[PDB]
Write a protein that binds this ligand. Sequence first.
Ligand code: HEM
Length: 154
Amino acid sequence: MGLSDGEWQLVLNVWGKVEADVAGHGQEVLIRLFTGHPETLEKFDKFKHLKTEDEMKASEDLKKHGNTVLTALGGILKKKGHHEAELKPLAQSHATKHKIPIKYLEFISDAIIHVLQSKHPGDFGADAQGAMNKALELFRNDIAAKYKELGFQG
Ligand code: HEM
């Protein structure tokens, strides 16, 4: 499940593109998640009512939350397989009040690979897509281990 140094280099390289506009990337990721998987939308009190891509873009809160999501994920990814320190608070909040199924983690991960493909193809070739998919599977897997401790499944 671990990533090779090469795979980590592929991940960090593309994250460099996200670094320039974390909020804007986060916005596009959530929009991709919400449009492809509308049931995910139901887990956000604030966004449950945004029916359209224009409405989602018009939401300042959605963009700000997008920033929040990718800022955290950025933290995890730059730690490269020594990341459980930032995972605990993430697992804790996605498995208690919220209750976010692992499969929704998969979906946002797909949304992430999709946005990076579209926006940064020259920095996201096959191996890099492979490596990011791995980094993100590792992340879900680790969170899912913490979900059990937190007593979450359903
Ligand atoms: C890479 C995946 C994700 C990351 C890094 C992430 C990160 C975060 C962070 C940092 C917060 C705010 C503080 C906290 O609660 O820990 C948060 C809150 C939240 N997360 Fe996530 N999240 C991810 C995936 C998801 C998904 C897929 C969903 C639901 C479909 C979700 C649902 C929520 C909700 C509903 C909140 C509170 C929203 C609010 O009050 O605005 N998260 N998440």
